[PDB]
From a paper:
Aurora-A is a Ser/Thr protein kinase that functions primarily in cell division and is overexpressed in breast, colon and other cancers. The activity of Aurora-A is stimulated by autophosphorylation of Thr288 in a flexible region termed the activation loop. Here, we describe the identification of a vNAR single domain antibody based on a shark heavy chain antibody scaffold that binds and inhibits Aurora-A. The crystal structure of the complex indicates an allosteric mode of action that is antagonistic to the mechanism by which TPX2 activates the kinase. In the crystal structure of the complex, Aurora-A adopts a canonical kinase fold, with a molecule of ADP sandwiched between the N- and C-lobe. vNAR-D01 has an Ig fold with two disulfide bridges. vNAR-D01 makes contacts with both lobes of Aurora-A, but does not closely approach the ATP-binding pocket.
To address the mechanism of Aurora-A inhibition by vNAR-D01, we crystallized the complex in two different forms and determined the structures by X-ray crystallography to limiting resolutions of 1.67 Å and 1.79 Å, respectively. In both crystal forms the asymmetric unit contained a single complex of Aurora-A KD CA/vNAR-D01 with a 1 : 1 stoichiometry. The two crystal structures are very similar, with an overall Cα RMSD of 0.97 Å. ADP is bound in the ATP-binding pocket but there are no magnesium ions present in the active site of either structure, and the side chain of Asp274, which coordinates magnesium ions in other Aurora-A structures, is displaced from the active site and instead interacts with the side chain of His254. Crystal form 2 was grown using 0.2 M ammonium sulfate, 0.1 M bis-Tris pH 5.5, 25% PEG 3350 as a precipitant. In addition, Asn36 and Tyr38 from βC interact with the αC-helix through an H-bond with the side chain of Glu183 (and van der Waals contact with the side chain of His187). These interactions are mostly conserved between the two crystal forms of the complex, with the exception of the contacts between HV2 and activation loop. Structure determination was carried out with data from a single crystal cryoprotected in 30% ethylene glycol using the WT complex crystal form 2 as a model. The interface of the complex buries 950 Å2 of surface molecule per molecule of vNAR-D01 or Aurora-A. The binding footprint of vNAR-D01 on Aurora-A comprises regions of the αC-helix, β4 strand, activation loop and the N-terminus of helix αE. The distortion is stabilized by interactions on all sides: the side closest to β4 is stabilized by Trp91 of vNAR-D01 CDR3; the side facing out to solution is stabilized by Asp33, Asn36 and Tyr38 of vNAR-D01 CDR1 and strand βC; and the inside is stabilized by conformational changes in the activation loop, most notably Phe275 and Trp277. The position of the αC-helix is incompatible with TPX2 binding, as side chains of Glu175 and Arg179 would clash with Tyr8 and Tyr10.
Author numbering:
A (entry chain A): 126 to 392
B (entry chain B): 1 to 105
Write the structure that this text describes.
Amino acid sequence: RQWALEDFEIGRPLGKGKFGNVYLAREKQSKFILALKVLFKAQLEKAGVEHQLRREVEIQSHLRHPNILRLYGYFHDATRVYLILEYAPLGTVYRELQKLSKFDEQRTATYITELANALSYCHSKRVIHRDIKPENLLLGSAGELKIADFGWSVHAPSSRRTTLAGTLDYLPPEMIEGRMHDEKVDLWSLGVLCYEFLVGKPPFEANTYQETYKRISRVEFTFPDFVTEGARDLISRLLKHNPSQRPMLREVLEHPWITANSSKPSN
Amino acid sequence: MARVDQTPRIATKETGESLTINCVLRDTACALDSTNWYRTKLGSTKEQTISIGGRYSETVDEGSNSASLTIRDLRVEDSGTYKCKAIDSCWLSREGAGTVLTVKG
Ligand SMILES: Nc1ncnc2c1ncn2[C@@H]1O[C@H](COP(=O)(O)OP(=O)(O)O)[C@@H](O)[C@H]1O
């Protein structure tokens, strides 16, 4: 495997992941700054995710889009896998949401546009995402959103029992009801994110798993009074129980609330 | 010497027929346990993932270090170049040389 650790200067940790740390790094010949994600093979294997991650990394290697974190390459030694990643200097959308409590309409519409552009590019390659959480979205130097979790699939359409345990909050009804799912799951994800960005919490949040499950299955959510008519409309269209009733990504990108408030355009 | 043999290299089929593509990872102890399938349709420049399910099925044979793709009820739209692309159990990149499929109809 041609890249090797000595190709890079290593700096401070950017964060600690489940299977290892992510470091600030610099390729020595170009001085290009990037991120080096370290994963311990034994840790992946014991978690039973080692096969799945190799599938996801292969998929990720084809995805070149301004709002998808770039995978530059990878290499390994006897105990560790190293992923060479685009460096996202402004951290996670999760942290930004913690800092600001909630996002204004222009920031929100702009993120949704960037997500829709990314997902539109993916769908054109017959690639679908799993659940999209704020913690898995990173921010680039100009504050541009990057889908960063390699959470790609693989099979469409599909009926295959998801880890439902974990966090239900971001899963669409058809996945928690054990029904068939396809690329329409990504539109549900956009609705949950649009809501969480504006409100500060996801719309089906409850105190127990069983309660959250019912909220999602029955699509029981309400809006704070400050959420405007245009946002309510878009979110309500995305959070349809019936996946086929959800809009196309192009329709999201063309929604009056998005076009009035987004500082970014389509493609 | 380690390599992927993808067969057949060229396939010409009539509509409604079937195609099976085999990929075998040879001369290495690394395991081909998780291959993804890709297609660039004739005329297009866009590489797409092949979704498994429906007309598209796959098998993997641990013992022979191989994986296969079968497409049923072939359509003219299916014409294009198909590849297995994978990261083997050694975390090394592997890919077949491709199958150029032409469907007439
Ligand atoms: N490419 C990157 N650029 C900048 N910071 C990153 C990058 N990747 C990860 N980080 C930081 O390090 C943490 C790494 O954890 P993450 O990639 O979420 O690990 P996990 O495998 O547990 O999801 C993130 O929360 C983020 O703060």
